[PDB]
Amino acid sequence: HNMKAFLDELKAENIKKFLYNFTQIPHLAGTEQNFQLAKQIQSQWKEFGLDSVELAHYDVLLSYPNKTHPNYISIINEDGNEIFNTSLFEPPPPGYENVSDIVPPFSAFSPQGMPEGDLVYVNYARTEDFFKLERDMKINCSGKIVIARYGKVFRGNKVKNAQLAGAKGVILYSDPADYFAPGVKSYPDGWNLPGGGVQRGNILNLNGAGDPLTPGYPANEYAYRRGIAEAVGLPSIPVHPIGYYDAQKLLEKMGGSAPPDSSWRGSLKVPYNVGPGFTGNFSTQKVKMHIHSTNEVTRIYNVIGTLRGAVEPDRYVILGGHRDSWVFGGIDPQSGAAVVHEIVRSFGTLKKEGWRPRRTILFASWDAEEFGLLGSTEWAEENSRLLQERGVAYINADSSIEGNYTLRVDCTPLMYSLVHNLTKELKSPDEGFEGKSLYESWTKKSPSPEFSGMPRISKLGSGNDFEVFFQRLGIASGRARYTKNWETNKFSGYPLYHSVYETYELVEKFYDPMFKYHLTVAQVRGGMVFELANSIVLPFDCRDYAVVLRKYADKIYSISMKHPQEMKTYSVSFDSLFSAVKNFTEIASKFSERLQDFSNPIVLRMMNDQLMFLERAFIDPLGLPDRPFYRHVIYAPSSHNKYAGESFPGIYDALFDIESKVDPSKAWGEVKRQIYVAAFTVQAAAETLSEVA
Amino acid sequence: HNMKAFLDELKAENIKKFLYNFTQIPHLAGTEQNFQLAKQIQSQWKEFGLDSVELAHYDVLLSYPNKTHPNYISIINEDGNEIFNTSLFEPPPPGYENVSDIVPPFSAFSPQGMPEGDLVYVNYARTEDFFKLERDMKINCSGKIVIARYGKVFRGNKVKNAQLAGAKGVILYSDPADYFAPGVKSYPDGWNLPGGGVQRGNILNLNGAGDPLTPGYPANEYAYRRGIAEAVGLPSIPVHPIGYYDAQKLLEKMGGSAPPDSSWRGSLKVPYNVGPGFTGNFSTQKVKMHIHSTNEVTRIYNVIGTLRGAVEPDRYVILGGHRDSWVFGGIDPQSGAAVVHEIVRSFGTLKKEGWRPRRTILFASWDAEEFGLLGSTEWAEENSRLLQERGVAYINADSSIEGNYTLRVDCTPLMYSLVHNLTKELKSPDEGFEGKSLYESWTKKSPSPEFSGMPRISKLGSGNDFEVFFQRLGIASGRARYTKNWETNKFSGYPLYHSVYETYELVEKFYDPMFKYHLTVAQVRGGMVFELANSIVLPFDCRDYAVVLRKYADKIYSISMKHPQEMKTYSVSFDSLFSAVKNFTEIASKFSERLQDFSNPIVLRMMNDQLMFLERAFIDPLGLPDRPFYRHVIYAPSSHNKYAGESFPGIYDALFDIESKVDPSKAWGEVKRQIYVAAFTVQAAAETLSEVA
Numbered sequence A, B: 001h002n003m004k005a006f007l008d009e010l011k012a013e014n015i016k017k018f019l020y021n022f023t024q025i026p027h028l029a030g031t032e033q034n035f036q037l038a039k040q041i042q043s044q045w046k047e048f049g050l051d052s053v054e055l056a057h058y059d060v061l062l063s064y065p066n067k068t069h070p071n072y073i074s075i076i077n078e079d080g081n082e083i084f085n086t087s088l089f090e091p092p093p094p095g096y097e098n099v100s101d102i103v104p105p106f107s108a109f110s111p112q113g114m115p116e117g118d119l120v121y122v123n124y125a126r127t128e129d130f131f132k133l134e135r136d137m138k139i140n141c142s143g144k145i146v147i148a149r150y151g152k153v154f155r156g157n158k159v160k161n162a163q164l165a166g167a168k169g170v171i172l173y174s175d176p177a178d179y180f181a182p183g184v185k186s187y188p189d190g191w192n193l194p195g196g197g198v199q200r201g202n203i204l205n206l207n208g209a210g211d212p213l214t215p216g217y218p219a220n221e222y223a224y225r226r227g228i229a230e231a232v233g234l235p236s237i238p239v240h241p242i243g244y245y246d247a248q249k250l251l252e253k254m255g256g257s258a259p260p261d262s263s264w265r266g267s268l269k270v271p272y273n274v275g276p277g278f279t280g281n282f283s284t285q286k287v288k289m290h291i292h293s294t295n296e297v298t299r300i301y302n303v304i305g306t307l308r309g310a311v312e313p314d315r316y317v318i319l320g321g322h323r324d325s326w327v328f329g330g331i332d333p334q335s336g337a338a339v340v341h342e343i344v345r346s347f348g349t350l351k352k353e354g355w356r357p358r359r360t361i362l363f364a365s366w367d368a369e370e371f372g373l374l375g376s377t378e379w380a381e382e383n384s385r386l387l388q389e390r391g392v393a394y395i396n397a398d399s400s401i402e403g404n405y406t407l408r409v410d411c412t413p414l415m416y417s418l419v420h421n422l423t424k425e426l427k428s429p430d431e432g433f434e435g436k437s438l439y440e441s442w443t444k445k446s447p448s449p450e451f452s453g454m455p456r457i458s459k460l461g462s463g464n465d466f467e468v469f470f471q472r473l474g475i476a477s478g479r480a481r482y483t484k485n486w487e488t489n490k491f492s493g494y495p496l497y498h499s500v501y502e503t504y505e506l507v508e509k510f511y512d513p514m515f516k517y518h519l520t521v522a523q524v525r526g527g528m529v530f531e532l533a534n535s536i537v538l539p540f541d542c543r544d545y546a547v548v549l550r551k552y553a554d555k556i557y558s559i560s561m562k563h564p565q566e567m568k569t570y571s572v573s574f575d576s577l578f579s580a581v582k583n584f585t586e587i588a589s590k591f592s593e594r595l596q597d598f599s600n601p602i603v604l605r606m607m608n609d610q611l612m613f614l615e616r617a618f619i620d621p622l623g624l625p626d627r628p629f630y631r632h633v634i635y636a637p638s639s640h641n642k643y644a645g646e647s648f649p650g651i652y653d654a655l656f657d658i659e660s661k662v663d664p665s666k667a668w669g670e671v672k673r674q675i676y677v678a679a680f681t682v683q684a685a686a687e688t689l690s691e692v693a
């Protein structure tokens, strides 16, 4: 009864069966079918042997198209006749043409409206795309409908950016340049997005708030809800996603200015003119959106499984991933949920033979992730006192695969050593690495840019259910999945993401026929939970935080040093931050020595508490500026792309575009304030590792 | 080596000697003499046997009169001749007439100015005094100088209230009605305030922020400071305190309206007319303030002593009280500091004979309390991560006596049982209770209004150094001192509070000749620290929180029920709060049973952690509305009187004066929101006591 027993019990064939089972019908959040699936998971986790399995439910703001009043976009002529209409649905894939309750493509939480106007093409609608438009090109988006390609960044940032540019609507589309890999066929004959395929997804800017109506507090039965007008993160202009057949029709007539350069051109046979409006012959034609989706408070269900710890039941290691899908969820999330299901089954096998982990393991099937991480966030809001005093670690478990090339891990520095050690003990599933370790294949395919013989591990970003646990509550967090080769494959994400084409057959035929990558990811995720819940000394190495803190301090200082004159004028020094990082390095080194030298369970637990509370020490209870739920001072989601992690985010945002600020004294004053906050927090975290008295 | 050994080692004669030692010269915060005293305490605590004794220093905003440009108030005539001037200093007491560096009476943090105008008398300048003036009497304070009597509430609230009434200055004075007990002589021949006596004190409204320039973060060497204009809690109009000889001169000529009733009349031979301005003959005369005090960033020093725990060194029991004084500090704070000094000495005696407490005891000599709890707050800001994960309890130790009648205890419900049990084991020092317990004399003199055979224990308010530990960080806190009989003695505080007359001789001659009340208070405070640091199971009874939560829920519901029609219209229910309190009662009862039945140190420490984190569970990281540093949902300082505790403060303030709000729907909506927050927090705190897995 050790890790090897746990790992060996995991079967690829079981993960295949579960994936099939979870993907036959849609499981949209707030729907009866997803509630049925919740009850099924609850039943099976009980059967599998967990001590308790409960549903935790909340009533949250969700968004759905109107069934009798479909969303669509038109080209209208001067008479007002709609001469072109975008599709009302994606052509269903082979054998699914009769499946009901496929939600049609829509942008969740769009307000209703029917705006009419001239089109401006804004590339990926990134901060720098708008800078280029407004500052360099002198194009005004005010009162225009913007059309943007999907890709590069989170769609909610695109919508925010369009809105602050004064757009009156946004059209999102999938360009083949970003969603069609050269030499691969469209679904069903390959893994590419067809011209009628469309990516669903919410366009909120929640910044960690969870349910838009109840920021800070669980959306329970007696919750007081904000009015819609005061809700968090809702867009103020209508938005709708389309495919590249329909996008071609909308782009082909575009006039005004040429694209500023080739990074603005996708792969369609159109000029990619920025606009505004259409070329001469069609200059009186306009674009009209028709959006009728409604926001509604709807009940959602998390499944929470508990396997009580034998020695420290008041210490919680959490494995959590979501269950709700846009349609069938073939990759997102069921390729993760099937992996969790088999992990539970394996732990349960051991439990039935009399074993218990040292610490409590909690297993979560979250609801409403697709609508803003709502299930994980409301539950963490409800249980925040328990999680901040008892939470050892959170391992996420959304999609197990986004490619078939190599491992991807994003995690706190505290888990680097755990991940290196675990992967050295696992077999690579890769062709040409038979009998080699996962560590070897991973390091070869994804080398660290700093360190020879080490793999690359990214910072945690967001756009997934670890966000409340890591950036709000400061619980050490990690995620892992198989991924594509980004060096040779330039497209954004996997092509069929959040489309009807993301099915069981997508995975079984193209991504992972033998379910070996799924099994590899079950071993990584399950292996991590096993070590975290069972190792006598928590498997965190504080010295790895010291190394990255120095790298981040160098980075942020380099950004500021682009403005040497202002640093002189305003006396901007990074000395305090570097001093704090030096102290952290020295104190962590001494703590590591002590952790090596000590039969005494109090000294042990005292030291496990120092390891556990070290991630927690990076939390500032005041939050980051205007983002009260992003409280971690080292890591926040990028203010320009929610998916990307930013380091020293407080100083980063204070420096961003600082040369354009009206009051340089005020702006540089705020840079110095953020330096102070960062240096203080680093020193305060270091001091939690000092001898306690 | 048990509690009795600790208690027996404490000597009245030692406390007398220390008090004498600490009171020969002024120890104003930020002055060289208070730094010298800090170094002396540090030396002696080392000598006494503590493991480490450090100074923790900060650079904070302090306020001092200008030595070459004195503050004073005048009656001016139409020509501009100053026909009456208030005193420049209090007549020094016998034998101190040559002591230098007595700070003259001033209101710390007053801005500079020389406003001229007509006087309005506003009674105690309470919220209801201003309501009576503006609403009932129709008197407009806009552009007037207000004169208010000291007493009833914290002076900072008076100044806030005057400022929001549009006053252009405030004069504070001590009325004999509030500071002269019938049949007792003025200092030096009794304990009464003489006509030339004046009460110093800050007039900030910090709401827990600490140093006005650095809210949230310690005022360390690299701190970024706000500009003065953005500082927290500074008054916007000049303020100055005077004695009743000078007040008589300012009040005797007052015209306009009569006092509305006898609760507006003090004891001087004047009419107590509200004004504005003077009676006919003198109607062209005006009042002129001259205030030249300056705010300056000044270094302050805390002394921090550590006695490392033998078994749980990472658990902290804190005994802390301040060292800075307005002048000699005969009562405030040295009657407390001398008691702490003897407590340290006694613990050190045991330590030298080989004993250690189970948990770590930290001893603190705080600086700058008189200027806004600045020393305790900056240090707690620096060490917040350590205190919130390790802080068992905080026992305050400011003035040991404010009378000679009976015990006064204000503390969390979690300490009620500890206090009842301890006091049953201590001898009463009271005449007529020889050979009886302190519990017996206390209960007889100060009976609980709810429960026969029990003593009254007040809620913690504020205006002292526990505020950061309790209302910000949620560490279980308590205070205890000897006090007066409030039933028969109607004056505010003790008469010589914050005056030059508060000397060693005041205490030795009038308050506590034999130092027996001092010794009794050393036993209560030291006994509490001893039990908290040494009991195997933390000496907190969660069921006492359940009883008070019900009492507070009844109270707040009764307040709301004054508005039955609005409760109908807006569907205002307290059901959720009562349900939460019921659940708390049931879960706490079950936790208490478990705490009775368990050789297992993990189960023990797990359960000690649940006891320790139970106060912490009442903290809301979002704070109370517009008061981010008051985070405890059950207790906050009254928004009308910082000294007084308020229960369910969020709901209380939402209901206060609600009948006067312009938008009843909005106001009742916020009542319901606060009900939700309170019910949720109570339920969440209850759930920390549930079985952990």
Ligand SMILES: *[C@@H]1O[C@H](CO)[C@@H](O[C@@H]2O[C@H](CO)[C@@H](O[C@@H]3O[C@H](CO[C@H]4O[C@H](CO)[C@@H](O)[C@H](O)[C@@H]4O)[C@@H](O)[C@H](O[C@H]4O[C@H](CO)[C@@H](O)[C@H](O)[C@@H]4O)[C@@H]3O)[C@H](O)[C@H]2NC(C)=O)[C@H](O)[C@H]1NC(C)=O
Residues within 6 Å of the ligand: A576, A577, A579, A580, A583, A679, A680, A683, B054, B055, B056, B057, B221, B222
């Ligand atoms: C990284 O860790 C190191 C510790 O190894 C910290 O070093 C401290 O740095 C501060 C400077 O920011 C030093 O502060 C200075 O303290 C002097 C007096 O300190 C005495 O007392 C303390 C107890 O509190 C002892 O520990 C200490 O050894 C000393 O005996 C002051 O006199 C200094 O103030 C004077 O100079 C400054 C700067 O020029 C002026 O602005 C002032 O007006 C004044 O004249 C100063 O405040 C401190 O002594 C150092 N501690 C130790 C133990 O060496 C780093 O701060 C830490 N990095 C971060 C980011 O925290």
Ligand SMILES: *[C@@H]1O[C@H](CO)[C@@H](O[C@@H]2O[C@H](CO)[C@@H](O[C@@H]3O[C@H](CO[C@H]4O[C@H](CO)[C@@H](O)[C@H](O)[C@@H]4O)[C@@H](O)[C@H](O[C@H]4O[C@H](CO)[C@@H](O)[C@H](O)[C@@H]4O)[C@@H]3O)[C@H](O)[C@H]2NC(C)=O)[C@H](O)[C@H]1NC(C)=O
Residues within 6 Å of the ligand: A054, A055, A056, A057, A221, A222, B576, B577, B579, B580, B583, B679, B680, B683
């Ligand atoms: C004091 O402690 C008690 C527990 O002893 C708590 O009681 C819970 O109270 C809520 C009501 O606020 C109950 O919620 C209801 O749950 C029903 C389904 O719950 C099932 O599943 C759970 C697992 O999550 C089981 O524990 C439970 O026994 C049930 O089998 C819902 O169907 C109810 O919703 C319906 O009615 C409401 C109200 O009329 C409608 O608004 C809805 O639209 C819907 O039709 C409802 O949500 C809960 O069941 C109770 N729990 C238990 C264990 O009994 C108190 O909440 C607590 N007090 C506070 C302040 O927390």
Ligand SMILES: *[C@@H]1O[C@H](CO[C@@H]2O[C@@H](C)[C@@H](O)[C@@H](O)[C@@H]2O)[C@@H](O[C@@H]2O[C@H](CO)[C@@H](O[C@@H]3O[C@H](CO)[C@@H](O)[C@H](O)[C@@H]3O)[C@H](O)[C@H]2NC(C)=O)[C@H](O)[C@H]1NC(C)=O
Residues within 6 Å of the ligand: A070, A072, A080, A081, A082, A083, A084, A085, A088
């Ligand atoms: C693009 O779509 C519009 C609107 O059509 C409606 O919405 C779609 C998403 C689908 O659900 C459609 O089935 C649905 O009709 C088309 O314009 C519309 O055309 C219809 C029929 O030609 C008009 O209906 C009426 O017909 C009778 C005549 O017997 C009269 O009583 C009325 O006067 C009216 O003409 C309808 O008004 C018109 N709607 C709008 C909003 O313009 C459009 O033809 C289509 N374009 C294509 C396919 O190129």
Ligand SMILES: *[C@@H]1O[C@H](CO[C@@H]2O[C@@H](C)[C@@H](O)[C@@H](O)[C@@H]2O)[C@@H](O[C@@H]2O[C@H](CO)[C@@H](O[C@@H]3O[C@H](CO)[C@@H](O)[C@H](O)[C@@H]3O)[C@H](O)[C@H]2NC(C)=O)[C@H](O)[C@H]1NC(C)=O
Residues within 6 Å of the ligand: B070, B072, B080, B081, B082, B083, B084, B085, B088
């Ligand atoms: C109330 O106090 C004022 C101001 O007096 C000053 O401030 C006090 C707090 C103390 O520190 C005083 O020592 C200090 O003077 C008095 O009015 C002031 O009177 C003086 C002297 O009479 C005036 O000084 C000048 O004197 C020479 C004449 O040789 C001329 O050069 C000047 O023209 C001027 O007269 C001073 O101007 C005047 N100041 C003000 C601000 O009005 C006031 O007499 C006193 N009232 C009492 C005791 O009733």
Ligand SMILES: *[C@@H]1O[C@H](CO)[C@@H](O[C@@H]2O[C@H](CO)[C@@H](O[C@@H]3O[C@H](CO)[C@@H](O)[C@H](O)[C@@H]3O)[C@H](O)[C@H]2NC(C)=O)[C@H](O)[C@H]1NC(C)=O
Residues within 6 Å of the ligand: A020, A021, A024, A039, A040, A043, A044
């Ligand atoms: C995915 O897998 C689950 C679990 O294996 C399947 O659900 C299970 O389906 C069986 C067959 O429908 C159910 O058993 C039945 O029970 C009813 C009475 O309750 C009885 O009438 C039948 O004769 C039969 O014995 C079982 O309830 C159900 N189990 C759970 C835990 O839900 C599910 O059908 C699979 N879904 C797909 C799409 O393959």
Ligand SMILES: *[C@@H]1O[C@H](CO)[C@@H](O[C@@H]2O[C@H](CO)[C@@H](O[C@@H]3O[C@H](CO)[C@@H](O)[C@H](O)[C@@H]3O)[C@H](O)[C@H]2NC(C)=O)[C@H](O)[C@H]1NC(C)=O
Residues within 6 Å of the ligand: A417, A418, A421, A538, A539, A540, A541, A596, A597
């Ligand atoms: C990942 O694996 C590495 C390599 O095994 C682990 O580091 C190793 O940890 C052991 C156990 O703490 C260290 O052993 C110690 O050696 C010293 C003698 O120098 C002795 O004082 C102790 O009693 C103990 O035996 C070992 O030195 C260390 N090896 C290296 C190369 O660092 C690492 O801890 C693992 N990481 C995690 C998170 O588990």
Ligand SMILES: *[C@@H]1O[C@H](CO)[C@@H](O[C@@H]2O[C@H](CO)[C@@H](O[C@@H]3O[C@H](CO)[C@@H](O)[C@H](O)[C@@H]3O)[C@H](O)[C@H]2NC(C)=O)[C@H](O)[C@H]1NC(C)=O
Residues within 6 Å of the ligand: B020, B021, B024, B039, B040, B043, B044
């Ligand atoms: C309050 O009590 C303290 C502690 O007893 C007194 O401070 C101590 O005073 C003595 C006598 O001045 C000091 O000893 C002296 O040392 C110097 C050299 O350092 C030497 O020149 C003298 O001959 C003498 O031995 C001692 O330093 C000092 N102790 C401490 C810890 O500060 C203090 O005087 C008392 N204050 C009052 C007002 O009574």
Ligand SMILES: *[C@@H]1O[C@H](CO)[C@@H](O[C@@H]2O[C@H](CO)[C@@H](O[C@@H]3O[C@H](CO)[C@@H](O)[C@H](O)[C@@H]3O)[C@H](O)[C@H]2NC(C)=O)[C@H](O)[C@H]1NC(C)=O
Residues within 6 Å of the ligand: B417, B418, B421, B538, B539, B540, B541, B596, B597
């Ligand atoms: C303040 O003093 C009271 C009175 O001594 C303490 O309550 C007493 O605590 C003891 C020890 O936990 C309880 O004894 C228990 O009795 C049951 C049998 O019914 C048994 O299961 C246990 O093994 C244990 O012997 C005792 O019942 C209880 N007495 C009362 C009247 O409640 C109280 O704990 C003290 N408070 C603090 C904070 O120390």
Ligand SMILES: *[C@@H]1O[C@H](CO)[C@@H](O[C@@H]2O[C@H](CO)[C@@H](O)[C@H](O)[C@H]2NC(C)=O)[C@H](O)[C@H]1NC(C)=O
Residues within 6 Å of the ligand: A066, A067, A068, A069, A292, A294
């Ligand atoms: C979906 O859209 C339809 C419009 O075709 C809405 O139905 C109409 O709503 C208006 C305003 O409430 C009523 O005056 C009409 O009588 C309704 N017409 C019909 C034909 O039903 C409908 O409210 C929307 N549905 C949802 C669920 O929001």
Ligand SMILES: *[C@@H]1O[C@H](CO)[C@@H](O[C@@H]2O[C@H](CO)[C@@H](O)[C@H](O)[C@H]2NC(C)=O)[C@H](O)[C@H]1NC(C)=O
Residues within 6 Å of the ligand: B066, B067, B068, B069, B292, B294
């Ligand atoms: C105390 O008040 C005096 C005024 O009597 C201030 O001294 C004057 O300040 C002004 C403005 O800075 C100068 O122009 C004068 O030359 C000063 N006069 C004298 C006679 O010194 C003084 O600044 C104040 N002191 C403090 C410590 O704030």
Ligand SMILES: *[C@@H]1O[C@H](CO)[C@@H](O)[C@H](O)[C@H]1NC(C)=O
Residues within 6 Å of the ligand: A140, A141, A142, A143
């Ligand atoms: C863009 O257009 C609007 C309205 O037509 C105008 O008010 C605004 O100032 C314009 N902005 C720029 C930067 O040209």
Ligand SMILES: *[C@@H]1O[C@H](CO)[C@@H](O)[C@H](O)[C@H]1NC(C)=O
Residues within 6 Å of the ligand: A191, A403, A404, A484, A510, A511
């Ligand atoms: C799977 O791997 C092969 C071999 O490298 C590659 O050609 C193919 O594109 C991969 N499939 C997917 C879905 O990435």
Ligand SMILES: *[C@@H]1O[C@H](CO)[C@@H](O)[C@H](O)[C@H]1NC(C)=O
Residues within 6 Å of the ligand: B140, B141, B142, B143
């Ligand atoms: C009080 O006086 C000021 C200025 O003289 C005036 O603007 C204000 O409205 C008055 N307020 C009331 C309540 O009478």
Ligand SMILES: *[C@@H]1O[C@H](CO)[C@@H](O)[C@H](O)[C@H]1NC(C)=O
Residues within 6 Å of the ligand: B191, B403, B404, B484, B510, B511
């Ligand atoms: C001390 O107690 C006596 C006796 O009750 C009382 O008359 C006297 O006023 C008290 N002294 C003080 C300073 O309260």
Ligand SMILES: [Ca+2]
Residues within 6 Å of the ligand: A209, A210, A211, A213, A214, A215, A216, A217, A218, A219, A378, A381
């Ligand atoms: Ca919420």
Ligand SMILES: [Ca+2]
Residues within 6 Å of the ligand: B209, B210, B211, B213, B214, B215, B216, B217, B218, B219, B378, B381
């Ligand atoms: Ca501060």
